[PDB]
Amino acid sequence: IRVVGSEFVQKYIGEGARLVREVFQLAKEKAPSIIFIDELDAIAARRTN
């Protein structure tokens, strides 16, 4: 399952989360399953103070 990374994050958010739960659900329902998750640099973050 190829999960797009562009679609992840918005300027105010809710749909970006929908696609995580969705492919998570789909993966369980149909195990074995390999969810390619590009890209962990549009949802990876660093902290700030």
Residues engaged in binding another protein (CB under 8 A) = 2, 4, 6-7, 47-49
Identify any residues that bridge with 3 across adjacent strands, giving them in sequence order: 37
Least distance in angstroms from the C-beta of 47 to another protein: 7
Mention every residue, 6+ apart, whose C-beta is less than 8 A from residue 7: 15, 16, 19
Least distance in angstroms from the C-beta of 6 to another protein: 5
Q: Which of 34, 39, 33 is nearest to 8 (CA)?
A: 39
Of 12 and 31, the one with the shorter C-beta distance to another protein is: 12
Of 21 and 47, the one with the shorter C-beta distance to another protein is: 47
